[PDB]
Structure 1
Amino acid sequence: AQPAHLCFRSFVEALKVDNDLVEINTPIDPNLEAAAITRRVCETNDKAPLFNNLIGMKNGLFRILGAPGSLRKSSADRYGRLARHLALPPTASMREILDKMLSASDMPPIPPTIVPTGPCKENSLDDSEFDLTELPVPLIHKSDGGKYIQTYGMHIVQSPDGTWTNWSIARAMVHDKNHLTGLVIPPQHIWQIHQMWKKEGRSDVPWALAFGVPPAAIMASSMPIPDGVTEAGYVGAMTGSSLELVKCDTNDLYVPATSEIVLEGTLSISETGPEGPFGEMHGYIFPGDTHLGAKYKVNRITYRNNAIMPMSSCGRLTDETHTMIGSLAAAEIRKLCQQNDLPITDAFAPFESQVTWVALRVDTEKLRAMKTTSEGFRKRVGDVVFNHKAGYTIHRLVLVGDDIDVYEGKDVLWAFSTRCRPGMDETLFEDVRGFPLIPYMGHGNGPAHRGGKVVSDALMPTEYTTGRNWEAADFNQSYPEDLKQKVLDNWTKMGFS
């Protein structure tokens, strides 16, 4: 077989064909070694590692693919792994990937198709045949509080009334032979659904966690598409094809037919267990910072022959927690702004900001027609974005005019540093939900869950009135066209590189 965006096994073959895979066939320790190799790959934009000989792999569980959504070294195919999640050419731009991810937002859903079996049913282990402590679950960072089996799988939970089935990524680690613990926090959909089941009060939440799902599905899992929208039908619409699902054996949830590994069980409405600490997306671990997390019971494991577990070795730049969390939040923010009649053309979370900022490119012709001011406009943008779940992870919004490419972190930093007067050109938001994972929130001086957000206006004053009133002091803008071309045409004749 099936296409790469619809079948993780084919996606791995796509990375090989692209010369973007290293297959490691000698024994590799899941205790730190796999994740350290993966971490070095992410910090250097190297090829993705496939660990085919993982110390502790028993009865087909499991191989590991690291860095599934990280960057390539070349600028021409920088985002090629992400393009391979979506059937795009490997040279696709970030604008094209985010447009593809947003495309289903004004299309009818294409609901999934139930099939009677699939590769995920090739093997099974009941409640008497597996032990999660006996699998080659990675220790990802040396101070982690557990072996994080779940960094790139899909949790599947459904509202009590059946009308909404949510697919999302949220971390989880092994607690004992048949339980995980993990992070289930507001305002995430897995938490919203959990709350529904707690208020009903009758049973634990039927649950599955599928690893190595269709790559188009894992991308939507990482995107804050709207409340109540079933990710399966959004992915159907975006790919133009109904996704094939099979029923779980022990519950009535449906998992992708080609999933590599499937856990079936329950998310408790009452129990907790120790969770964390973990080396997280902003680049830190606080050793010993353990909290009580949600508790998941595993009743059954099903899996493909020669199953492969995807792993994110997350932390400092650049991994899936940057390329997918930041970019996909920015995409949804862009749409959100446009639906609120704000003149936003583009949005991106700069990697330099540890994806805590989003830069918002403004159509300044439209801004001018609004006849507004910085104070007013900053307030409107911040109220729309920071009061919505799509803004949760983002603590600074940078407004820039049409001359800035928000996908170029150098140009966002230039505009921020030169066009936004500290204090006067900014509005602080202290009564909005904060992202506690950012160290300055959860480990900082103020409330972990509230405030610490800002809108930084890097629009210049005439951008609101009569139009841009500068030219850049750069090669592009400070020399006429004929001269620039002469210089470029003579560059290597004259002796330059």
Structure 2
Amino acid sequence: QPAHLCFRSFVEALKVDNDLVEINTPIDPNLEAAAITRRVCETNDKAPLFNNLIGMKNGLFRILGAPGSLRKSSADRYGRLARHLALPPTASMREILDKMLSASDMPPIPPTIVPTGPCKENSLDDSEFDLTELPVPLIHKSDGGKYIQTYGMHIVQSPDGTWTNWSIARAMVHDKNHLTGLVIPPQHIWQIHQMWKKEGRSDVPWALAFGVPPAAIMASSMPIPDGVTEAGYVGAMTGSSLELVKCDTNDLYVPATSEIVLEGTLSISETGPEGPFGQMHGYIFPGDTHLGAKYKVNRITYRNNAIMPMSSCGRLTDETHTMIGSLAAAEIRKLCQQNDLPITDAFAPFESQVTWVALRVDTEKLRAMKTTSEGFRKRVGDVVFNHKAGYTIHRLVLVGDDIDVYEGKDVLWAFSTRCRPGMDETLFEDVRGFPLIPYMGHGNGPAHRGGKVVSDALMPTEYTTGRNWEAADFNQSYPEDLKQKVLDNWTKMGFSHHHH
């Protein structure tokens, strides 16, 4: 089975890529696995596969850390992401995001139901498992629980059956048969949960699948539109119908090659303690526990020699940056284009802790609009910040055509030199804010509202007659023939490879 359609095959791809380290000696899930993984993430090392995890019983479980983190080399920097999508490992960010947006004007390819799959190789009923006895990792020393769920896919369906949503949301072990987790607006898991609550008849049928097809975990991390079933979108993007099996205890369908599947319910009435968790902005607030959603687990099914993917998230760079940020940015690009705004490219700079998105403007189109900064800033921010795709993003940086938004140094250059503080900015206080950013939920103002800004790093002539500068750099401040001479004579003169 191809790597993008089967997690087990993905793992093998990473091996073949010389991008895996298999650790076959005992590793403690209490902090050690996550510490190793954190180090990998801070240094762009190879992904760790823990094949000998202290506490693994009856095949539950091995761990793969850093499944969507960065490689060291520039030439295959995003290679692990490319492997989730059948792309060459040298694929650019633009090519990855274009792949993820490609199904947005294609017909969905609905999934295919099959009678069984690897995810049925083993099962544990209500009398045979205990979630407190599994080798669930403690990821950060101050976490409020053992976070089993950092890279699985929650599966919930609208009461009417018409929309089945796949998404990632964190969850931790509460007791032998329950999790607690984040279910917050405007996320689709929350939107669906609200529909069940309003109906008031039953708890929400639920499954959580770990080690799902890599192309599915990437759509899981992406804010595709409301009411769109991720399975169909993945099918369209990959050109193939996903093979799903029915759960044993409910009528939901899980990917046939899922490593591990939990089946049960998301309560419409109960909560339990959840968090804190060391998260995407880089922080843990020890003791900041709050009531979260509560899931009941009725049944576990799993592959032989099951592997649990884990994100040891926090400071740069991990899946919370590479996937959350980039995929939001992709959707924001599309949203802007659909609103007739002249945006060519969007990216969340890692340097911003994925709280900014830089928007590359087609300034020939902008010129034709005959507008102003004030007007244009307002229009862009109203589009993006009133939409779910803008939820995580607190600063939009508008930049002209000379800036590569996929290069943080060039975004910082433009921001610092072209956007006058105050005058070239519009503040948005009456928009939904992202509370998990420290300056929001642990800050000076309302946790859930405002704190957003559009920073205009377009120069004034970009609205009127065209760019009126050249950069004072090697590329722009010297003619071609000279530059090439300089390069050709560089090592001859005594000064100091793409792949590395």
Question: Which TM-score applies when normalising by structure 2?
Answer: 0.99
For residue 335 of structure 1, report the CA deviation from its aligned partner: 0.1
For residue 162 of structure 1, report the CA deviation from its aligned partner: 0.1
**Residues of 2 paired with 1:278 and 1:7: CA distance?**
29
**Residues of 1 paired with 2:362 and 2:280: CA distance?**
31
**Equivalence for 1:165:** 164
For residue 435 of structure 1, report the CA deviation from its aligned partner: 0.2
For residue 240 of structure 1, report the CA deviation from its aligned partner: 0.1
**Residues of 2 paired with 1:484 and 1:316: CA distance?**
39
Residues 56-84 of structure 1: per-residue CA shift (max 9 Å, x gap): 00000000000000000000000000000
For residue 418 of structure 1, report the CA deviation from its aligned partner: 0.1
For the aligned residue pairs, the C-alpha RMSD in angstroms reads: 0.2
**Secondary structure in 2 aligned to 1:39?**
helix
For residue 128 of structure 1, report the CA deviation from its aligned partner: 0.2
For residue 425 of structure 1, report the CA deviation from its aligned partner: 0.0
**Equivalence for 1:257:** 256
Residues 20-57 of structure 1: per-residue CA shift (max 9 Å, x gap): 00000000000000000000000000000000000000
**Equivalence for 2:154:** 155
For residue 346 of structure 1, report the CA deviation from its aligned partner: 0.1
For residue 108 of structure 1, report the CA deviation from its aligned partner: 0.1
For residue 105 of structure 1, report the CA deviation from its aligned partner: 0.1
Residues 330-354 of structure 1: per-residue CA shift (max 9 Å, x gap): 0000000000000000000000000
**Secondary structure in 2 aligned to 1:251?**
coil
**Equivalence for 2:392:** 393
**Equivalence for 1:483:** 482
Matched, 1:11 2:5: no
For residue 315 of structure 1, report the CA deviation from its aligned partner: 0.1
**Equivalent runs, 1:21-420 vs 2, <5 Å:** 21-420=20-419
**Residues of 2 paired with 1:55 and 1:494: CA distance?**
58
For residue 385 of structure 1, report the CA deviation from its aligned partner: 0.0
**Residues of 2 paired with 1:496 and 1:106: CA distance?**
51
Matched, 1:463 2:473: no
Residues 210-259 of structure 1: per-residue CA shift (max 9 Å, x gap): 00000000000000000000000000000000000000000000000000
**Secondary structure in 1 aligned to 2:147?**
coil
For residue 186 of structure 1, report the CA deviation from its aligned partner: 0.1
Q: Structure 1, unaligned stretches of length 5 or more?
A: none
Residues 182-214 of structure 1: per-residue CA shift (max 9 Å, x gap): 000000000000000000000000000000000
**Secondary structure in 1 aligned to 2:412?**
helix
**Residues of 2 paired with 1:116 and 1:280: CA distance?**
38
**Residues of 2 paired with 1:366 and 1:145: CA distance?**
50
For residue 374 of structure 1, report the CA deviation from its aligned partner: 0.1
**Residues of 1 paired with 2:431 and 2:425: CA distance?**
16
Residues 423-453 of structure 1: per-residue CA shift (max 9 Å, x gap): 0000000000000000000000000000000
**Residues of 1 paired with 2:394 and 2:99: CA distance?**
25
Residues 286-320 of structure 1: per-residue CA shift (max 9 Å, x gap): 00000000000000000000000000000000000
**Residues of 1 paired with 2:3 and 2:276: CA distance?**
34
For residue 464 of structure 1, report the CA deviation from its aligned partner: 0.0
**Residues of 2 paired with 1:283 and 1:292: CA distance?**
22
**Residues of 2 paired with 1:390 and 1:72: CA distance?**
27
For residue 161 of structure 1, report the CA deviation from its aligned partner: 0.1
**Secondary structure in 2 aligned to 1:31?**
coil
**Residues of 1 paired with 2:454 and 2:336: CA distance?**
14
**Secondary structure in 1 aligned to 2:330?**
helix
For residue 279 of structure 1, report the CA deviation from its aligned partner: 0.2
**Residues of 2 paired with 1:420 and 1:376: CA distance?**
15
**Secondary structure in 2 aligned to 1:324?**
helix
Moved over 3 A (4+): none
Aligned residue pairs total 496
**Residues of 1 paired with 2:436 and 2:427: CA distance?**
19
For residue 18 of structure 1, report the CA deviation from its aligned partner: 0.1
Identity %: 100
**Residues of 2 paired with 1:110 and 1:495: CA distance?**
59
Q: Structure 2, unaligned stretches of length 5 or more?
A: none
**Residues of 1 paired with 2:137 and 2:485: CA distance?**
57
For residue 416 of structure 1, report the CA deviation from its aligned partner: 0.1
For residue 112 of structure 1, report the CA deviation from its aligned partner: 0.1
**Residues of 2 paired with 1:127 and 1:442: CA distance?**
38
Residues 438-494 of structure 1: per-residue CA shift (max 9 Å, x gap): 000000000000000000000000000000000000000000000000000000000
